[PDB]
Amino acid sequence: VKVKFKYKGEEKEVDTSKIKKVWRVGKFVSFTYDDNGKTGRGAVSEKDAPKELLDMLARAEREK
Amino acid sequence: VKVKFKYKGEEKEVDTSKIKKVWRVGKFVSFTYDDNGKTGRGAVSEKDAPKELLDMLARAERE
DNA sequence: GCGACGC
DNA sequence: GCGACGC
DNA sequence: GCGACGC
DNA sequence: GCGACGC
């Protein structure tokens, strides 16, 4: 599963398996990911978020 | 529990796990914290402080 | 003023 | 030693 | 504001 | 070391 979002006008795509941290900011889902070793930031609206990312977020909010 | 504060125009947030000294100034809670490598300073009105910070304050004052 | 980093 | 958080 | 790597 | 995702 890949998340597609544009960040800084450029469109990006990220495999959910590389997502490291996930959190909610209003109506969007914010996250960090492992981009070939280095860590990047990405975000996507909650409505456009793959279900797998939403599961990740729910899991993150429950453990704290 | 994180502490939200505004410092030098910037809204910031810090975990209480990283807050060190805490003291009261009139009606606000002042504190220092680990800002990886250096100690930062933050402050929030008591009315807006989370319980955990106020608890740390009570502890500091009782010492 | 109240309490307590970076110059 | 002195300037730079909420009220 | 909201939460938490790119200049 | 400070600050630049949707509404």
Count of structural domains within chain B: 1
- Full residue range of the structural domain in which residue A32 is found: 1-64
The C-alpha atoms of residue B20 and residue B34 are separated, in whole angstroms, by 8
Resolution (A): 1.9
The C-alpha atoms of residue B45 and residue B25 are separated, in whole angstroms, by 9
Question: Which chain D nucleotides are covered by protein, judged by CB under 7 A?
Answer: 5-7
B28 touches strand D (CB under 7 A): yes
The C-alpha atoms of residue A47 and residue A28 are separated, in whole angstroms, by 8
Q: Alpha-carbon Rg of chain B, whole angstroms? A: 11
SS3 A12: strand
The C-alpha atoms of residue B48 and residue B31 are separated, in whole angstroms, by 14
Sign of the dihedral defined by the CA atoms of residues A59, A40, A18, A37, in that order? negative
- Buried b or exposed e, range B21-43, using 16+ CB within 10 angstroms: ebeeeeebbbbebeeeeeebebb
B8 touches strand C (CB under 7 A): no
CA angle B17, B20, B25 (to 5 degrees): 120
Q: With the CA atoms of B14, B15, B18 and B19 taken in that order, what torsion angle do they form, in degrees rounded to the nearest 10?
A: 70
Would you list the DSSP string of A23-58?
EEETTEEEEEEEETTEEEEEEEEGGG--HHHHHHHH
CATH number at residue A54: 2.40.50.40
Calculate the angstrom distance between C1' of E4 and CA of B28.
25
The C-alpha atoms of residue A23 and residue B52 are separated, in whole angstroms, by 22
Q: Among all strands, which nt has the closest C1' to B15 (CA)? A: E4
The C-alpha atoms of residue A61 and residue B58 are separated, in whole angstroms, by 29
Question: Which experimental method was this entry solved with?
Answer: X-ray
